[PDB]
Structures are given as structure tokens and as C-alpha cells.
Design a protein around this ligand. Structure first.
Ligand SMILES: [Ca+2]
Ligand SMILES: [Zn+2]
Ligand SMILES: [Zn+2]
Length: 169
């Protein structure tokens, strides 16, 4: 047990990179969905996320289909719609999205941002909850706009703290 409890990120700032954009949606709209999710978490936490166009990033995001050299192949549109590894070296922190399902940004079948935000919850060590107003709810539900819940804000803030930032005149 090198780290006490679950391995938490020692740095207060993290970086991320998109390995590739699926032809499911234009990259311009995918960056907005992913960029908006990180901003929401950083908005209520002193944590910061910066996109990198080169070099290895703390969080790697990519899209894969069927079996992709992993011990958890997707079983058709059934099973989980995506998954991620625990925050750690090697494949740890990586997050894959099932490109077999059709991703959308409206009342369609599913919202890509809702699933992306859920993956971040697991990456930050956040667990599911019985609060229907929480995005990490086990059952998928259309809530329209995606916003964090007080239960989730207090949870991530308790681990790190409040986003205090005394600005000078
Ligand atoms: Ca699936
Ligand atoms: Zn995968
Ligand atoms: Zn989950």
C-alpha cells in the first residue's frame, strides 16, 4: 500500500488528451462537451485541467470497438456503455468509450457529456450515490442540463478542500 486508502493524485493540477475523435460527432462539438465537464469540476475545486497536444497526459481519452486488447470486451450494445481504470501509472487513469453505440448531444438515445462526466467521477474516486439529483446515479436518466450535485461537490471538496481564491483588486 504505497498510498494510504485509494491512490489519489498527488498533483493539484492534471492534464488530458483526446487520442482520436469518432466520426459520430464533429471534434468541435466533442471538445465543447469534454471541455465543459472539466470546467464544472474545476469550478468547485482548486483543481485545474489543461489540454495538451503532445506528450503523455495524466488522463488519456480514446474510443474503441469490440475487443480492444482488454480483459473486458464490450458485449454488443449491452453491458456498460464505457469504462475507466483506477487512477494509477500504466493504463491507470485511461478512459475508453464504446463507439459501437450512437453518441448524441440532445434528447436522442444518450448524451455523450453525461457519460463523460460520469467517467470523471470514477477517475476522481467519486462513487455512485442514491441521490437522484446526482449525475453518478447508477440508472441513466435525462436531466437536460448537466450540473454537479451538492453531495458530489462536498465529497470532492472534502478530499481536497474548497476552491478558495482571494483575488486582489
Ligand atoms: Ca456496450
Ligand atoms: Zn476499453
Ligand atoms: Zn459508474
Amino acid at each position: 500500500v504505497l498510498t494510504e486508502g485509494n491512490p489519489r493524485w498527488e498533483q493539484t493540477h492534471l492534464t488530458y488528451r483526446i487520442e482520436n475523435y469518432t466520426p459520430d460527432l464533429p471534434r468541435a462539438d466533442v471538445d465543447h462537451a469534454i471541455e465543459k465537464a472539466f470546467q464544472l469540476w474545476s469550478n468547485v475545486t482548486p483543481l485545474t485541467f489543461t489540454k495538451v497536444s503532445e506528450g503523455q497526459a495524466d488522463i488519456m481519452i480514446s474510443f474503441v470497438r469490440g475487443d480492444h486488447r482488454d480483459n473486458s470486451p464490450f458485449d454488443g450494445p449491452g453491458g456498460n456503455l464505457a469504462h475507466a481504470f483506477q487512477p494509477g501509472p500504466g493504463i491507470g487513469g485511461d478512459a475508453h468509450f464504446d463507439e459501437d453505440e450512437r453518441w448524441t448531444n440532445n434528447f436522442r438515445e444518450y448524451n455523450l457529456h453525461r457519460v463523460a462526466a460520469h467517467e470523471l467521477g470514477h477517475s476522481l474516486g467519486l462513487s455512485h450515490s442514491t441521490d437522484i439529483g446526482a449525475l453518478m446515479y447508477p440508472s441513466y436518466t435525462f436531466s437536460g442540463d448537466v450540473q454537479l450535485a451538492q453531495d458530489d461537490i462536498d465529497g470532492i471538496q472534502a478530499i481536497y478542500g474548497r476552491s478558495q481564491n482571494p483575488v486582489q483588486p
